[PDB]
Amino acid sequence: MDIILGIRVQDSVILASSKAVTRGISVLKDSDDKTRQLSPHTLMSFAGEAGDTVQFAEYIQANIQLYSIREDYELSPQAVSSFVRQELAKSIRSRRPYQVNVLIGGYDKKKNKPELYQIDYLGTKVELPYGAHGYSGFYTFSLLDHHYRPDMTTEEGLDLLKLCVQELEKRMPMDFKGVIVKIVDKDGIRQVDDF
Amino acid sequence: NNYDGDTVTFSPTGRLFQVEYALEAIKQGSVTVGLRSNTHAVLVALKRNADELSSYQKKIIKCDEHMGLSLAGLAPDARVLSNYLRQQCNYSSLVFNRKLAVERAGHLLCDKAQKNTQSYGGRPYGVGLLIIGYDKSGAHLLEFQPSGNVTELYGTAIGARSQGAKTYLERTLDTFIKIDGNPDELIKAGVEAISQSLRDESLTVDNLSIAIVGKDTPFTIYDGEAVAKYI
Amino acid sequence: DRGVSTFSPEGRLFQVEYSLEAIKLGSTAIGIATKEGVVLGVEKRATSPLLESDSIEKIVEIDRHIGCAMSGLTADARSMIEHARTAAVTHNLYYDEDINVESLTQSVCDLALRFGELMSRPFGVALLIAGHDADDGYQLFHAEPSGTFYRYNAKAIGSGSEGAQAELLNEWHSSLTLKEAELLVLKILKQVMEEKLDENNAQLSCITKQDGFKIYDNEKTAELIKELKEKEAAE
Amino acid sequence: TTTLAFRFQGGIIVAVDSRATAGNWVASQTVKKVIEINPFLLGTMAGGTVDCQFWETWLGSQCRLHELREKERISVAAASKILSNLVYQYKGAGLSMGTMICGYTRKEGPTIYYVDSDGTRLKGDIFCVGSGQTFAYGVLDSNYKWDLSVEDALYLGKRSILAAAHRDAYSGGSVNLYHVTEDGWIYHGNHDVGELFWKVKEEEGSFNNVIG
Amino acid sequence: GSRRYDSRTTIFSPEGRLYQVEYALESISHAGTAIGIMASDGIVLAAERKVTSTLLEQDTSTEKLYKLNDKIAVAVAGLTADAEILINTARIHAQNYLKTYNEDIPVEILVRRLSDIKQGYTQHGGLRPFGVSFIYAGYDDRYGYQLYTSNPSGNYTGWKAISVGANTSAAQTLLQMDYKDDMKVDDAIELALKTLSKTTDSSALTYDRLEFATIRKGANDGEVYQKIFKPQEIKDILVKTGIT
Amino acid sequence: QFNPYGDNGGTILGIAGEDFAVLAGDTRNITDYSINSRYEPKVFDCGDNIVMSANGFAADGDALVKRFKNSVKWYHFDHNDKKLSINSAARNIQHLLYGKRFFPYYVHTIIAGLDEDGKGAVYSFDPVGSYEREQCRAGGAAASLIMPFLDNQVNFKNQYEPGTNGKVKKPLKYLSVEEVIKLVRDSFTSATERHIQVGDGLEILIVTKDGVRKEFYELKRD
Amino acid sequence: GYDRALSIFSPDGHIFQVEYALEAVKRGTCAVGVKGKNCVVLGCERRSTLKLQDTRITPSKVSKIDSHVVLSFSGLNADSRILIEKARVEAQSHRLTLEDPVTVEYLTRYVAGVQQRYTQSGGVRPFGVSTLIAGFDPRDDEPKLYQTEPSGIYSSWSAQTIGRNSKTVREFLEKNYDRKEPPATVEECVKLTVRSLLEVVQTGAKNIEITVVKPDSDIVALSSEEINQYVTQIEQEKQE
Amino acid sequence: TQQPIVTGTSVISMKYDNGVIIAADNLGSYGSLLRFNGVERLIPVGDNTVVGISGDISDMQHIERLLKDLVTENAYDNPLADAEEALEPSYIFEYLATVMYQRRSKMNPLWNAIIVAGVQSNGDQFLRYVNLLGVTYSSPTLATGFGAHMANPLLRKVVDRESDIPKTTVQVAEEAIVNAMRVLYYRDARSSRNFSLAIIDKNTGLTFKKNLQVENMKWDFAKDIKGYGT
Numbered sequence A: 001m002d003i004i005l006g007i008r009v010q011d012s013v014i015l016a017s018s019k020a021v022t023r024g025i026s027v028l029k030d031s032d033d034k035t036r037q038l039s040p041h042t043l044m045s046f047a048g049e050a051g052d053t054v055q056f057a058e059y060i061q062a063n064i065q066l067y068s069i070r071e072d073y074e075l076s077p078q079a080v081s082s083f084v085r086q087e088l089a090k091s092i093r094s095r096r097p098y099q100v101n102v103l104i105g106g107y108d109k110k111k112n113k114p115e116l117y118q119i120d121y122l123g124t125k126v127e128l129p130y131g132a133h134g135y136s137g138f139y140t141f142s143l144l145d146h147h148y149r150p151d152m153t154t155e156e157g158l159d160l161l162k163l164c165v166q167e168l169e170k171r172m173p174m175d176f177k178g179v180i181v182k183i184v185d186k187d188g189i190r191q192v193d194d195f
Numbered sequence B: 001n002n003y004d005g006d007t008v009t010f011s012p013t014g015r016l017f018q019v020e021y022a023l024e025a026i027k028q029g030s031v032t033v034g035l036r037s038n039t040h041a042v043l044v045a046l047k048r049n050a051d052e053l054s055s056y057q058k059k060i061i062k063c064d065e066h067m068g069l070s071l072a073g074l075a076p077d078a079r080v081l082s083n084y085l086r087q088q089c090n091y092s093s094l095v096f097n098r099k100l101a102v103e104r105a106g107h108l109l110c111d112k113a114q115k116n117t118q119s120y121g122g123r124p125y126g127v128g129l130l131i132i133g134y135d136k137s138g139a140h141l142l143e144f145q146p147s148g149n150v151t152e153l154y155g156t157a158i159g160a161r162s163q164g165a166k167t168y169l170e171r172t173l174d175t176f177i178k179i180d181g182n183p184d185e186l187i188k189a190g191v192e193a194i195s196q197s198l199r200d201e202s203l204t205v206d207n208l209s210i211a212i213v214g215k216d217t218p219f220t221i222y223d224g225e226a227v228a229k230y231i
Numbered sequence C: 001d002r003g004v005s006t007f008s009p010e011g012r013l014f015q016v017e018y019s020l021e022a023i024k025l026g027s028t029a030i031g032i033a034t035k036e037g038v039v040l041g042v043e044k045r046a047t048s049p050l051l052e053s054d055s056i057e058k059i060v061e062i063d064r065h066i067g068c069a070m071s072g073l074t075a076d077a078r079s080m081i082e083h084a085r086t087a088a089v090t091h092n093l094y095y096d097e098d099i100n101v102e103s104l105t106q107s108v109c110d111l112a113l114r115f116g117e118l119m120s121r122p123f124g125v126a127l128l129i130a131g132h133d134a135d136d137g138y139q140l141f142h143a144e145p146s147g148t149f150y151r152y153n154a155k156a157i158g159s160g161s162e163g164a165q166a167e168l169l170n171e172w173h174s175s176l177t178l179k180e181a182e183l184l185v186l187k188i189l190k191q192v193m194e195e196k197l198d199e200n201n202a203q204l205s206c207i208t209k210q211d212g213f214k215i216y217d218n219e220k221t222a223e224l225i226k227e228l229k230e231k232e233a234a235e
Numbered sequence D: 001t002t003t004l005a006f007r008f009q010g011g012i013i014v015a016v017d018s019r020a021t022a023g024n025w026v027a028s029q030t031v032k033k034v035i036e037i038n039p040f041l042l043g044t045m046a047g048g049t050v051d052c053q054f055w056e057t058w059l060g061s062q063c064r065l066h067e068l069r070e071k072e073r074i075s076v077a078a079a080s081k082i083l084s085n086l087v088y089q090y091k092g093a094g095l096s097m098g099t100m101i102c103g104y105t106r107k108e109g110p111t112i113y114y115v116d117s118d119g120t121r122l123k124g125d126i127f128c129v130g131s132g133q134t135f136a137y138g139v140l141d142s143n144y145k146w147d148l149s150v151e152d153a154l155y156l157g158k159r160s161i162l163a164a165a166h167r168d169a170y171s172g173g174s175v176n177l178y179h180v181t182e183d184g185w186i187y188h189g190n191h192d193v194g195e196l197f198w199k200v201k202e203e204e205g206s207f208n209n210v211i212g
Numbered sequence E: 001g002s003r004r005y006d007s008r009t010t011i012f013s014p015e016g017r018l019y020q021v022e023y024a025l026e027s028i029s030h031a032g033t034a035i036g037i038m039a040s041d042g043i044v045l046a047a048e049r050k051v052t053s054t055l056l057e058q059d060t061s062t063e064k065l066y067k068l069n070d071k072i073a074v075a076v077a078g079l080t081a082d083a084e085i086l087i088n089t090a091r092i093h094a095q096n097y098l099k100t101y102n103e104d105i106p107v108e109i110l111v112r113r114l115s116d117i118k119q120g121y122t123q124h125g126g127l128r129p130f131g132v133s134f135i136y137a138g139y140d141d142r143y144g145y146q147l148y149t150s151n152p153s154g155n156y157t158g159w160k161a162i163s164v165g166a167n168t169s170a171a172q173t174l175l176q177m178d179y180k181d182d183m184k185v186d187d188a189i190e191l192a193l194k195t196l197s198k199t200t201d202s203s204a205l206t207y208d209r210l211e212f213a214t215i216r217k218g219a220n221d222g223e224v225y226q227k228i229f230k231p232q233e234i235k236d237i238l239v240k241t242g243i244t
Numbered sequence F: 001q002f003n004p005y006g007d008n009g010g011t012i013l014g015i016a017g018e019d020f021a022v023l024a025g026d027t028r029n030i031t032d033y034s035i036n037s038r039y040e041p042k043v044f045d046c047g048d049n050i051v052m053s054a055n056g057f058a059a060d061g062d063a064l065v066k067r068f069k070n071s072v073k074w075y076h077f078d079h080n081d082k083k084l085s086i087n088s089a090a091r092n093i094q095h096l097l098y099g100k101r102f103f104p105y106y107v108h109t110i111i112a113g114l115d116e117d118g119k120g121a122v123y124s125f126d127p128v129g130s131y132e133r134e135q136c137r138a139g140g141a142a143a144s145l146i147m148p149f150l151d152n153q154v155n156f157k158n159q160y161e162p163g164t165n166g167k168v169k170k171p172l173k174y175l176s177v178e179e180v181i182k183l184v185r186d187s188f189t190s191a192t193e194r195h196i197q198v199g200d201g202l203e204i205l206i207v208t209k210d211g212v213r214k215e216f217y218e219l220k221r222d
Numbered sequence G: 001g002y003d004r005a006l007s008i009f010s011p012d013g014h015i016f017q018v019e020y021a022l023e024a025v026k027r028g029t030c031a032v033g034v035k036g037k038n039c040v041v042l043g044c045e046r047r048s049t050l051k052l053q054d055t056r057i058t059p060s061k062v063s064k065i066d067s068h069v070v071l072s073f074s075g076l077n078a079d080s081r082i083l084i085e086k087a088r089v090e091a092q093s094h095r096l097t098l099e100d101p102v103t104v105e106y107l108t109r110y111v112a113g114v115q116q117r118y119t120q121s122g123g124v125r126p127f128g129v130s131t132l133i134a135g136f137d138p139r140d141d142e143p144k145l146y147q148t149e150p151s152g153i154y155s156s157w158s159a160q161t162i163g164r165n166s167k168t169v170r171e172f173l174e175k176n177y178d179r180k181e182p183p184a185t186v187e188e189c190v191k192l193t194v195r196s197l198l199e200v201v202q203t204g205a206k207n208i209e210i211t212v213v214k215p216d217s218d219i220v221a222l223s224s225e226e227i228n229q230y231v232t233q234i235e236q237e238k239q240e
Numbered sequence H: 001t002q003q004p005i006v007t008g009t010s011v012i013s014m015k016y017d018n019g020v021i022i023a024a025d026n027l028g029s030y031g032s033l034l035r036f037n038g039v040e041r042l043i044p045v046g047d048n049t050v051v052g053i054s055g056d057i058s059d060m061q062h063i064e065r066l067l068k069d070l071v072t073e074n075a076y077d078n079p080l081a082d083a084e085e086a087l088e089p090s091y092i093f094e095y096l097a098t099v100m101y102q103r104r105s106k107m108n109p110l111w112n113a114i115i116v117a118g119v120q121s122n123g124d125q126f127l128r129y130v131n132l133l134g135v136t137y138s139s140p141t142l143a144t145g146f147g148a149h150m151a152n153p154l155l156r157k158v159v160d161r162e163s164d165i166p167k168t169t170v171q172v173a174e175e176a177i178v179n180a181m182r183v184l185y186y187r188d189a190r191s192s193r194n195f196s197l198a199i200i201d202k203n204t205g206l207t208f209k210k211n212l213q214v215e216n217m218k219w220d221f222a223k224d225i226k227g228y229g230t
């Protein structure tokens, strides 16, 4: 775990997440997918304490999937993000809290708008045009402040994202073994295989 | 009649019918005998089968190296009560490094059976037990009834047609009590005692069940070819 | 009404005696023990021809060395099997060994009387528990809802039990081979069954020291049915 | 400890050392660090001896109960997740485990899952776990190809443990080899480092740092 | 012990019916009639108060119609005390959903949960069931305007128009006769009142013996408004349709 | 602050032969620099031809032995007087120890007996329940002194055949009960010389098919 | 807590509460399940004494337990919701721990186990519900159709019906269904299902619901017009 | 978790040919303050056992109550309470040892060191030790606190092993115990001159001696000692 990014553009949400899994002085894996599909038009990336991350992500995934079957209906990204926030807000005052930070990218089919939510382990939610967790933000936010425009296309968003990964690969201390990029739009979720 | 629905109800003459119906289950059970001298204490038990293809229901259970019992009635209830005795004997050993007195064993069984006869929902135990043992005051024989009543005796018998063996032991009292330092003769007396309760059936090799405990003898059970000596 | 754990004037528990009547309504199950193995066979008894008979599971594995057949309210047996499997595996975890067939049966029978006012009523199903161990060899047990179990050389339970038991009394001897026992279960099942016996409405199984507990295929049983018919016509 | 397992053309190789330590005290040279869960499943052990031993033995009981209940051998994914969910319940209590669940099934094919005591669970082709994992990685990575033969793959696994056994002070004793195929696991012997080191040095011409 | 006095509320009859549920429905059939009618642009709720006294305070009274949230209301038929227990539960449940998802609760979800509570009292616990039947009238952005009913069995169903309480047989026949799908709210108001006027056990239907409420999109642009009618407003609507 | 653990010293040793097995242990019991008892046995016959010793903190050692002895008793009650095999005993002890994983028994446990093929068996445990069958194991205060001597003399480690250029190893063979007792006595006299917590007396328990025999020898009392 | 043993044995060896729960199932609307060569079809009756209904929002008779399994029922409607909810939760719990969706047999076994538990637990009555569970196992193309009942027994069926007048439609299926050659296509399977319901229903208007399940989570419900075409076709062939 | 407040110092004991002897001073210290002087730290149980207790006095008084209650409980439904089924020293010890270990295992110990001395029914001498940790051991001589460091060496000169027990009379044994008590008064800063002594013999039974004093002390050589060097 370490690097997770998110960019909301005109018609889609793009999530980029690092591939490395490191323990001690060894990179155990360089092809790790730090994300789970919560619903056909909602994707959640995650980063934080070992074990907690996947356990939390899959627990949320199970609950949203349960809701979908029960109501035969897909929850809005806003509704999913609120559910996730409340779970983390409960967690922080538990005996052992989930130390997990997430980004939730979704496409609201009723509004026909992409939506990106950033939620930290305390349960702090914010809707944003672009977001990041951990040390990544210290480089990417200022970069996006400059280059980001609200009316960009998905292709323009991917180039903007390439610019962020290049900067991180230049100035970050650790080798995070590149990123897996996924796009969320009106047609659902798909993965970019060549990045 | 109207006062036998549960154990919590007294009859107008002051009887507990559910306790009496539990007592009836013992009378249907197969006969078992208990007797003792000053040195040893013996249990003899007639085992019962379902048919010729089945095994013979085991009647005797070991509780400790120095104590055990024979059963008559509901066998599962005997398993519950014997397991409780095993724990109590074991508590006395681990905590006090002390072999549980046979008299205390009776007091504990009495009190356990009693609680089941004064509360709603529960039921009385449906089994009678003969507890033998050798402790710091010599050999002992006890008779347990699920009413709660426990009685120390020289000899006794419970089960179907138990009156025959109980009469014999009442006649033989003066003889068998002085069989000291002789296990085989005390068993012979017990085997002859249970024989007074037999009808149409005789004691065979996989039918008879004997158990003994004494001064220099741990509680041991004899079945199969090991009881052929006493037929 | 009246208490669940009430004694009758004859000294029997009403609910236990009534559960025994439910078991008499159940489909027939037979078990025979030999020195070469133990055979377990059951009547499937499909209620309708549209019902896929292979989904009727009345013979069941508890461990590699212990098998089980049932008769009566078969839904009640699920938690008994679940307990038996856990008991068997748990003992292997605690002692690094197979568990004795008798000890397994005793553990199952401890559930029996755990009812009252614990569960609300006794089990309405009887079990035949077959197995092998190093100490007492090949064994067959009959476990009732009374909490009692008997070892048997041969035993039948269910609706055609008293008729089948009388037949087993004559046919069983201490030198029976496994093949002889297989045919004998089929023979006695065909006698007491309502519908005509075939591979689809009856099922065989066995437990041997070498190969463990095995449920036979419909192809294997069909040949044993054909072998049985030929031998009866041969004299 | 040093343990590894890698996936290749002909299935899965699994190799482990046999040393156990209490600080600098070498407590045992003959510890079995592979647990045989069933004819198709293996588990490796690194970290606290008892934690690994106890819970992987328990894992085998849970896998047996699965195939009794479901009438089908458990998947490697499901088996690994039983163990990972268990240790996650104890997260923070102080369990110390680095395990690898290796096996073949029809639906999955040859599969290796890394599972540790802080709840991490990872599917992968190559893993090295233990105090001498880095030494094993160095040799294994530099010589690994997917197209290795069964003979060459067995040797590389053996040679990688030997490399770590030599350099890591808390690894040694002997090498235990396993090969996992479509038909199940096959044991390929216990190899004492005492004799194996000199045999490999002479025949291979490596280990020139050591006085011959 | 206490077995002697147990009624055994949660058992089956030999015919496979739940005694207590059936008897609770018999209780509800004597309660004042309540009607719900769903139109294309709104929903009407009409209910008849149980034999009124002239010294009853009419304006500051609530017996039949209760507000669950801003978008959902219910008409009651049965024991009022029982209904209020369930209403407070439903009110809390709606706020839990809003707190969790930051969205107003979908009507069916609220109805299902309330009906699941009733079901529980028929299967376990040994308590008597709630002697209440509800008509749920509400709106959400998935299905729009919706009418449901639940009863002591815990079974619920959806409706275009429906009646509960007394004379439902006669009332349902009249609604089935005059109802059509392209109906407006103002027409549905008239149907609701006309139906009560014919099915009532009273001599004549008057303002003081009624409770009335609408759920329209008659607010300003794309938002729903709940109107619980005042006494004078019922008096006027009764004159406007020519009943008095 | 109250410290629930203590160190009672002493050392123990188990060796297995072809048709026998020995479990030895010194009889000294100490705290800090004081002697509590010169003869306090810590090797026990537990029944079913299983001998056991749990060395370290004596209160935990006694508790464990007491619980295992009791475990054997209930094994007989629950499984028709079946003999508890040494391998089964070992697994049972692992669960006893691990049951207190988060408040451990502070002891090194060794058991000895015969396996189901009649051959000598020795199992050893860490404080939390890890176990392993071995030909040879020393445990306790002087374990680090005795164990390497056993590697050399029992398992013939670092010993090669004379004249074979260090190519052929000294072949493994079983030792006689006489030869094993010699090694035990020498191991403890050496340990007594160089370790302050070891001395006073040596008590060996030998296990054959015929039963459990005892032998006692004096050790230096300084 | 309320402890009373409600389900108990009677002198003749029957559990009357379980048997009276079967009477509740017999009262319920008819439900039918027919499995073809590459599909399963679930047909359901809807009584027509209820006009002025809103079919958009009214609870449907067939419920999805997961994307690949469906459950229909006969008996008490309120009781069915409790079983469906439990089944849905267990479906997600299975995916979470086993990393694979439930088999149809497993899901059936779970639901049947719940029903059984309510037959020997204190303070509760049995479920007045029998279910038909149908679907396709993950990565499998063999159709599955199972039945459960209040007692807790479950079994697999080539074709089966439950509810009121089920003995009439079971009679129809027993002669019209060939084991050697099941309905080869979707159309054939639906037609046989509609035919069987037309023996009992009344009118083929808004009284029949049909749900088709195909492999790889392919489930769809038919509309009125689509079903009405089958009704129109069958009646014209009948007049012969 | 505790800390001891009012404390009692050494308890010393040994075996002799026909029985056992045990002793302990009558002081209840409050840190360095020698607060209470009338404290009895030897508690007889029946006519065949004496329990000597050192450490925390509040916990000692609790243990007194437990032993007192044990006697009462043993007498219940027991016709042979003063004969065959009387409380043995081994029974009383095992009970205390069980309690001590259970309390340490709950991290809330009875802050004591205990010596149970007595004679069994068959005549055998009983002498065993137990403390706050639940640690138990037996020896021909036993002592707690400073007694372990100073008394045991002196008592082991009389009875060094098992074979020395038959050769040791009650006169010789008591002399050694009384001497050890004097030495402890010289050298233990939390000891007193007044003490109690108990003898349990297989023939003469239980003899409990109160209000003994340390005497025949050597102090005269002190007058010759001047300064610390020059």
Ligand SMILES: *[C@@](C)(CO)[C@](*)(O)[C@H](CC(C)C)NC(=O)[C@H](Cc1ccccc1)NC(=O)[C@H](CC(C)C)NC(=O)[C@H](CCc1ccccc1)NC(=O)CN1CCOCC1
Binding pocket: D001, D002, D019, D020, D021, D022, D023, D025, D027, D028, D031, D033, D045, D046, D047, D048, D049, D050, D052, D096, D130, D131, D170, D171, F104, F126, F127, F128, F130
């Ligand atoms: C390589 C070889 C080293 O890391 C491997 O990782 C192996 C794995 C194999 C054995 C499965 N690991 C060890 O050998 C492991 C290292 C270790 C030690 C302690 C904690 C974590 C990891 N060693 C052990 O687990 C030893 C095995 C014994 C020697 C058979 N056990 C101990 O150290 C035990 C128990 C440790 C412990 C863990 C958790 C809670 C409490 C204790 N401790 C002792 O035996 C104490 N010690 C022995 C020496 O005498 C003084 C007391």
Ligand SMILES: [Mg+2]
Binding pocket: D164, D165, D166, D167, D168, D169, D170, D171, D172
């Ligand atoms: Mg090394």
